[PDB]
Structures are given as structure tokens and as C-alpha cells.
From a paper:
Congenital myasthenic syndrome-22 (CMS22, OMIM 616224) is a rare genetic disorder caused by deleterious genetic variation in the prolyl endopeptidase-like (PREPL) gene. The PREPL protein consists of 2 structural domains: an amino-terminal 7-bladed β-propeller domain and a carboxy-terminal α/β-hydrolase fold catalytic domain connected by a hinge loop. The active site is comprised of the triad residues Ser559, Asp645, and His690. However, in contrast to its homologues PREP and OpdB, PREPL does not appear to possess protease activity despite the structural similarities.
Residue numbers in the entry: 111 to 133, 140 to 686, 694 to 720
Write the structure that this text describes.
């Protein structure tokens, strides 16, 4: 998370709790200690275009709030100004060469606001934008050629964009298009012509719409390029001559190189193991660098040189796991006949007897997808002979908006059905038998893991949960604390409508704990959180033990009892180590899991 900003040809990074300017020799612009903060970590650095000032925002743990500190970038590394609670900021070079800082903070929870800080003649904080609606978030973005500073007013379903001239920082912002509910727009400039990324008209289809910078209304927009329906745009990298569009769909990645000054589109060939895209913020201006990664392979560097056909792998580092592990894309068939993508990872020199411990990962909530970034512990499990699988199930977002809508408020059980289908499908393919199956889930995904434990316990041997959202019904029916509308729409309100109360009762894993055989379950939980009360987990743990205890008393006759383990913490490696030891003990695998990280 270490912030790195390169400008003026010298990079600026935070080291030793002090703002540092690097050409092993560095110059300290500021000492973060003076701010009287504990463990202050720099989240954002923005360097004035003419290097007179540098601004950065500094945050500490256990604080929602952070402060933006402005240092003179002059030979004097002294403080110029500071401003608390700044969400974002950016610099614009005035026509008088005055580097003015635009920044966004919030006047209480009432509204957010954009101010322009002038230092050279002491004009300080002039207001350029004021907010009216607390549900929207104001964020600043300047494009690459600094033609237009953009004020982005955003929500998840809709956005509004206002432009501030990069050649006239004092002018009032100009609205491109008044907000339309359900429509989000992102704006980039090429040559007194704008390209707009938008889902106007059709919510499930993002498209490239072009228009003159002086003719911003929707009615004047033409069509430049369209993406496949329900694909996810992760990024759009604008250049003078072309743009590079980065897309994801399902479990496939695509890169589209689209000429703008030359209307011809080019698709790039990506390797089959890539499961996600890492974007660079080096903003190099005559190349489009990016990295590809997978949960079992550290990020690799690729660069597209708009100039030549292809010179992508400039990186000299490569990992043999590319050839020693295989990435299968195998969909499962649901109870209602739908296809549920699943990503499966296994060794290519694996034995004919494909009956090895299988780890299944599920989230299935809030429209989120499963993060595919590299995790050394997951790779080790594969090196030891583990088969990993990721289930892209209803309630998440990999296949479109309807995937979030389904497997949700009145239909959560569909996410459960998709998880069940995935597990049975893997067993059906023959990767593992139930005795070697392991399931893992986090926070919201714990609902699905819990519910599966109650409905089909014979499918899993051991389950590993982190701070799971288990007692859904009491958490949701807690009228004392108002339920956030966001959640209220991710879990029906049982306090206002009996059908939600009944639907939730039907899937809530706490409520449905019943005397029967269970998988061994290890729970990692924390002392202090807001989303997952510890008392919920403790009650679950106590009730779960009682159910299996009653089961064991009537039918056990010497049979072993599933190990129910609750580990409370106020370190990631310690957590991982404990989880691996738990699973290996349950799976009777022993331990040679030695690694460098």
C-alpha cells in the first residue's frame, strides 16, 4: 500500500515516518512525526506541476479521518498548509503558472465540497462546487494532458460529470449532462473532443460515445465503439492517438486497442492463466503497461507499445508455475439449469489418482467478484498437491448485474444452490471425494458456507471461516441499530415484512443449527468490528457444539466428534499458519509446508 508518485523525473515515497524525496540517498521534505500521529501512512501524493508544492494525505489506524498536508516543494521543505478530512485532491497549473490545489472534503454528513487552494498571493480556499445530496460521493480526476479537471459526482447506479478548464482554473465548472438515474458516465479528452464511457439507455451495456468538447449534451453524442453486453470495464487508458480498453467477463480477460485518430480496433492475445488485471499508475505517456496475475502466480509485466506490433514481455522474471499448474474453466449446472462458472487450479504433473484435498472458495454477496490476486499460501497448497477452486456464484458480480440481483434478497438460496452444484460437479468430474473437500468463506460468504453445512454436511470434511456473518436473522432484526439500506437490500428486512423474516429464518445458518453430523469448523473471529458482532459468533459456536453433542450422545458410540474451534484475535501469517495446521490435522496430511513468505 506504500504510495509512490514520480514527477519532475524524481520519485517521492514515504520512508521512516517522514515525507521522502528520492532522486540510496533521499531528501526529507517533511517529518510526519510533527503531525503528532501514530504510525502515519501516506495514502496519496500529488506533486504540483511546477514543483512548488507537494500535497499528500496522511492516515493512521483506528481513524476514519485523515489530513491533507501541503509542503512547499521549494528548497524550503517547510509546511505551507493543511486541511482535514480530504477525500481527494489534484493540482492544476494556472495560466499565471500558479499551481492551485483542488480538493474535496465534506462539511459534516450534510454535503461534500470542492475548494481551490491558491498560495502565491494568499487567496487560499475558493469554493467551486457544493453538494446537495449526501448519497453521492465527489471525487477529483485530472486527465493526462491536463486539458480538463473532472469533478465526478458518483453513486453506484448513476453519475454526473462537471468539467473545469485546465487552461482556466478560476472558471465555474460546466455540466456535461444532468444526471439520469441508472446511468454512469466516465469522461476522457483526446483533442477538443471527448470520449465518453457510458451505459446510457441500456444499463447492462457500456459503450464508447464521442462528442466535441464544446457540444456536451447526450443529444449531440455519436457512437464510436461498443463492448459485449454485461462485460465489465475495469479501465480505459486514454492516449493522444488511441485508447486501451481493459475488459473482464466471466472468467475471461480481454484487451482492446482502439485507435481514435485512426478508426481501427486491435485485440491483444493474453495468456490463458490470467485471471485478473493489475493496473499501473506510472502513467507512462508513450506505452500502455499492465500486469497479469492469478491467485497462484505473482503479477507479470506486460507493455503494449502503440508504436510497434508487439513487444510485451519486457520483464526478465518468469515463474515455472505457468507450466506446472493448469487453469481449467469448468461451469457447474445449477438446480434450475443455469451455468455457474468455476475456476479450477491443479498441478500438471499431478498423479493419475486425482483424489486430493480440494479447497473451495465462495463469497456470493454484494455484487462482488472473487479477488484473484496472488496469495503465496494458496500457491503453497497447490505445490503440496492441493486442487483449488473458486465458485462464481449468484449473489456476486462476475456475469452481470442480474447475478447480483439473483442470489440475493428474496433469492439467497439460489447462491446456495450454485455452491452445492459446484461442489457436486467437482466430485462428479472426479477431482476429489467428499472426504477430502474443504470449504472456505469470509464475512458475508460465511452465510453460504454455514447454510451448506446445515443442508448438505456430508459434502465437506473441514470448513474454515473468517469473521462470518452467521446470525443473519438477529443481525438483521436488530431494530435497536437501524439497518443500512445497502444491507437492507442485501438481506430482506425481517422487521417490516414477515416474508423476509421467514425467508431469512430458512437460510440463516444460526437459526437452522440442528443435531446432525457436521464438518469440523474452524472460526477466526475478532474482538471488535461493526459488521460482525462477536457475540453472534460465540452464540453460534455454543449452539453448534450443543447440536453435535446431542447427535453424538444418541448415535456416537465411540465415533469422533467434529472439532469446533473458535480463535479470537484483537499476524496474517500467524492466521494462515493456524488455518493450514487445522486443515492438515483434519485431513491427516502431516506438514512440509515450508515457504519463504
Amino acid at each position: 500500500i506504500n504510495v509512490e508518485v514520480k514527477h519532475g523525473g524524481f520519485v517521492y515515497y514515504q520512508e521512516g515516518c517522514c515525507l521522502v524525496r528520492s532522486k540510496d540517498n533521499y531528501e526529507v521534505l517533511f517529518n510526519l512525526e510533527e503531525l503528532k500521529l501514530d504510525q502515519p501512512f501516506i495514502d496519496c501524493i500529488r506533486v504540483a506541476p511546477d514543483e512548488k508544492y507537494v500535497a499528500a494525505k496522511i492516515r493512521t489506524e483506528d481513524s476514519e479521518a485523515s489530513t491533507c498536508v501541503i509542503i512547499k516543494l521549494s528548497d524550503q521543505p517547510v509546511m505551507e498548509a493543511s486541511f482535514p478530512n480530504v477525500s481527494s485532491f489534484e493540482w492544476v497549473k494556472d495560466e499565471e503558472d500558479e499551481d492551485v490545489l483542488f480538493y474535496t472534503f465534506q462539511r459534516n454528513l450534510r454535503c461534500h465540497d470542492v475548494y481551490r487552494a491558491t498560495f502565491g498571493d494568499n487567496k487560499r480556499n475558493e469554493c467551486f462546487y457544493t453538494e446537495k445530496d449526501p448519497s453521492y460521493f465527489v471525487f477529483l480526476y485530472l486527465t493526462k494532458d491536463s486539458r480538463f479537471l473532472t469533478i465526478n459526482i458518483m453513486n453506484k447506479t448513476t453519475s454526473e460529470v462537471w468539467l473545469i478548464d485546465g487552461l482556466s482554473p478560476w472558471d465555474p465548472p460546466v455540466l456535461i449532462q444532468k444526471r439520469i438515474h441508472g446511468v454512469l458516465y466516465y469522461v476522457e479528452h483526446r483533442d477538443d473532443e471527448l470520449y465518453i464511457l457510458t451505459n446510457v439507455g441500456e444499463p447492462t451495456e457500456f459503450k464508447l460515445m464521442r462528442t466535441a468538447a464544446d457540444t456536451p449534451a447526450i443529444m449531440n453524442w455519436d457512437l464510436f465503439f461498443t463492448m459485449k453486453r454485461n462485460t465489465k470495464v475495469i479501465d480505459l487508458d486514454m492516449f493522444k492517438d488511441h485508447c486501451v480498453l481493459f475488459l473482464k467477463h466471466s472468467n475471461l480477460l480481454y484487451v482492446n486497442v482502439i485507435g481514435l485518430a485512426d478508426d481501427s480496433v486491435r485485440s491483444l492475445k493474453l495468456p490463458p492463466w490470467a485471471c485478473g488485471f493489475i493496473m499501473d499508475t506510472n502513467s507512462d505517456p508513450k506505452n500502455c503497461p499492465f500486469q497479469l496475475c492469478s491467485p497462484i502466480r505473482p503479477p507479470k509485466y506486460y507493455t503494449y507499445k502503440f508504436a510497434e506490433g508487439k513487444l510485451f514481455e519486457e520483464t526478465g522474471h518468469e515463474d515455472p508455475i505457468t507450466k506446472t499448474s493448469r487453469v481449467l474453466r469448468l461451469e457447474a449446472k445449477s438446480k434450475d439449469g443455469k451455468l455457474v462458472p468455476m475456476t479450477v487450479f491443479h498441478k500438471t504433473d499431478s498423479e493419475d489418482l486425482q483424489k486430493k484435498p480440494l479447497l473451495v472458495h465462495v463469497y456470493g454477496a454484494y455484487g462482488m467478484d472473487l479477488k484473484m490476486n496472488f496469495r503465496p499460501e494458496r500457491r503453497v497448497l497447490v505445490d503440496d498437491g492441493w486442487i483449488l477452486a473458486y465458485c462464481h456464484v449468484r449473489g456476486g458480480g462476475e456475469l452481470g448485474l442480474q447475478w447480483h440481483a439473483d442470489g440475493r434478497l428474496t433469492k439467497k438460496l439460489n447462491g446456495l444452490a450454485d455452491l452445492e452444484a459446484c461442489i457436486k460437479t467437482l466430485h462428479g468430474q472426479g477431482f476429489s471425494q467428499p472426504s477430502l473437500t474443504t470449504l472456505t468463506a469470509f464475512s458475508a460468504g460465511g452465510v453460504l458456507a454455514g447454510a451448506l453445512c446445515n443442508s448438505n454436511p456430508e459434502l465437506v470434511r473441514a470448513v474454515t471461516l473468517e469473521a462470518p456473518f452467521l446470525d443473519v436473522l438477529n443481525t438483521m432484526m436488530d431494530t435497536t441499530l437501524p439497518l443500512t439500506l445497502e444491507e437492507l437490500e442485501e438481506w430482506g428486512n425481517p422487521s417490516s415484512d414477515e416474508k423476509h423474516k421467514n425467508y431469512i429464518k430458512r437460510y440463516c445458518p444460526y437459526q437452522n443449527i440442528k443435531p446432525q453430523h457436521y464438518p469440523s469448523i474452524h472460526i477466526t473471529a475478532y474482538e471488535n468490528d461493526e459488521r460482525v458482532p462477536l457475540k453472534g459468533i460465540v452464540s453460534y459456536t455454543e449452539k453448534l457444539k450443543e447440536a453435535i453433542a446431542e447427535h453424538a450422545k444418541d448415535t456416537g458410540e465411540g465415533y469422533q466428534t467434529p472439532n469446533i474451534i473458535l480463535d479470537i484475535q484483537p499476524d496474517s501469517h500467524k492466521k494462515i499458519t493456524a488455518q493450514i495446521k487445522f486443515l492438515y490435522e483434519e485431513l491427516g496430511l502431516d506438514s512440509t509446508s515450508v515457504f519463504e513468505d
